[PDB]
């Protein structure tokens, strides 16, 4: 759709220049690509992430036009996120996929992503290494030798990320 | 029989900001990171590999527009270029 399509000619040119170092692509007719979007807009003790609805709509359409079946999940707790991940890692569609896209969107801190029931005194965060852990060769062999792209839209703390310089 | 395989490989994270730092969001425009990732995706998915596209995204956040933000690519184990060959 809105994605600028790759022409057969240029595709083979790309395919020619460095074939040996490209992740193989699975035929369009048989592959079942999966993608998972976890978005948290509603929180019990943190300001609502107003605008998420637009991000969701945005990513979903994109992934779909890229050839991915998009499973959307809203307002989960770390536990629920950890569960949904184990589920996604076990999906049968991966056996016939060539890559996968995981997308997280929610508040966050430096150590991890914030789940719906998170508070200052009682944590509810998903440690980043856990996502990498649940989708590796041991916990998800269906994706061995296949691209696993994680995209995260979350704060990494409170600092505004800037310093001043003179001029 | 059996063979050994790498426990971790072919991964690539892409965060909206750098550690310790926040990311921006607008009520009727959504996250800048997102809207921008999409914009670039729609544009260069046909000719650039994912890593390159991610870089191009970081590059658009280079000049601090008040709502400063710097997207980070992390834990990359992609041993090859990943072109999305949209259109097939």
């Amino acid at each position: 759709g809105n994605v600028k399509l790759c022409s057969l000619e240029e595709a083979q040119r790309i395919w020619k220049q460095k074939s040996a170092e490209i992740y193989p692509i699975m035929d369009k007719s048989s592959r079942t690509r999966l993608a998972l979007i976890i978005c948290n807009e509603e929180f019990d003790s943190i300001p609502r992430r107003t605008g998420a609805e637009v991000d969701i709509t945005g990513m979903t359409m994109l992934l779909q036009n890229l050839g991915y079946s998009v499973d959307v999940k809203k307002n989960l707790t770390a536990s629920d996120m950890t569960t949904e991940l184990e589920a996604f890692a076990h999906r049968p569609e991966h056996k016939t996929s060539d890559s996968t896209f995981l997308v997280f969107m929610s508040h966050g801190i430096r150590e991890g992503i914030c789940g719906k029931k998170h508070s200052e005194q009682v944590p509810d965060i998903l440690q980043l290494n856990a996502i990498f852990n649940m989708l590796n060769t041991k916990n998800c062999p269906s994706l061995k030798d296949k691209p696993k792209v994680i995209i995260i839209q979350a704060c990494r703390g409170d600092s505004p990320g800037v310093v001043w310089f003179k001029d | 029989a059996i063979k050994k395989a790498h426990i971790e490989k072919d991964f690539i994270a892409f965060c909206s900001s750098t550690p310790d730092n926040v990311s921006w969001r607008h009520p009727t425009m959504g996250s800048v990171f997102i809207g921008r990732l999409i914009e670039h995706m729609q544009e260069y998915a046909c000719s650039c590999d994912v890593e390159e596209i991610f870089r191009k995204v970081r590059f658009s956040f280079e000049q601090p527009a008040g709502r400063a933000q710097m997207p980070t690519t992390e834990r990359v184990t992609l041993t090859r270029c990943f072109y999305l060959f949209p259109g097939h």
Binding site: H107, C155, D158 | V22, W24
Partner: peptide, 4 residues
């Protein structure tokens, strides 16, 4: 604009 807000903080994510």
């Amino acid at each position: 604009w807000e903080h994510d």
